[PDB]
Amino acid sequence: PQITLWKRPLVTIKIGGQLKEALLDTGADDTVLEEMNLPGRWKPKMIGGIGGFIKVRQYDQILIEICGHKAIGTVLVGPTPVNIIGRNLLTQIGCTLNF
Amino acid sequence: PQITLWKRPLVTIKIGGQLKEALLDTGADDTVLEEMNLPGRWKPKMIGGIGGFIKVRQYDQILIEICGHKAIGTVLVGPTPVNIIGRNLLTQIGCTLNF
Numbered sequence A, B: 001p002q003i004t005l006w007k008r009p010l011v012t013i014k015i016g017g018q019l020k021e022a023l024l025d026t027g028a029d030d031t032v033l034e035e036m037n038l039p040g041r042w043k044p045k046m047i048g049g050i051g052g053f054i055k056v057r058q059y060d061q062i063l064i065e066i067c068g069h070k071a072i073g074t075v076l077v078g079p080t081p082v083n084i085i086g087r088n089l090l091t092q093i094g095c096t097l098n099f
């Protein structure tokens, strides 16, 4: 698929048995999702952007399906205002920028 | 060009006659550069990111060349963690996501 950028590049993802809308975000190294109560062990982390840092929980080897494309990797969970698919998973679905 | 995402999508930009490095950021509506001197008038603005809101200087109709492609548009200047090129200019250079 080709996604133009006139509007936010939001897509449906599937994670932890839930469907959600998330940004395909080339500016994010890693993936950050809204607060959700996933099972398993996690590690605390702090991640920073415009405005400062938020506290998140780092979960490893999480399965996530992005527009029907399967991926597995680290997902950070916390009080982000938007679900953010970062490069750690975008590479796994073969996503490129083109101009 | 086609840019893969196993590394940060950093490119050279020219703005105000000066070269800088910036991140192509599909998760950003707007283009935000770290503190710099730019000619012309500006307006105070607020913008929100993952960690809260910051005060920026809004420069409108600014010439900026991104990886050899010209844009003219709004550039916000303020305490962003890194220089980001957002959708307002990515659309101008014809950038799409593809997978």
Ligand SMILES: CC[C@H](C)CN(C[C@@H](O)[C@H](Cc1ccccc1)NC(=O)O[C@H]1CO[C@H]2OCC[C@H]21)S(=O)(=O)c1ccc([C@@H](C)O)cc1
Residues within 6 Å of the ligand: A025, A027, A028, A029, A030, A031, A032, A047, A048, A049, A050, A076, A081, A082, A084, A086, B023, B025, B026, B027, B028, B029, B030, B031, B032, B047, B048, B049, B050, B051, B081, B082, B084, B086
């Ligand atoms: C430092 C480089 C970037 C700033 C990094 N960010 C990605 C970036 O796309 C964010 C996404 C975003 C965030 C909040 C609300 C909308 C969109 N957009 C953003 O701040 O855009 C500004 C400018 O335009 C406006 O529209 C949207 C907001 C305004 S991040 O989220 O802070 C981030 C930090 C660390 C990690 C670790 C896990 O890797 C992962 C992500």
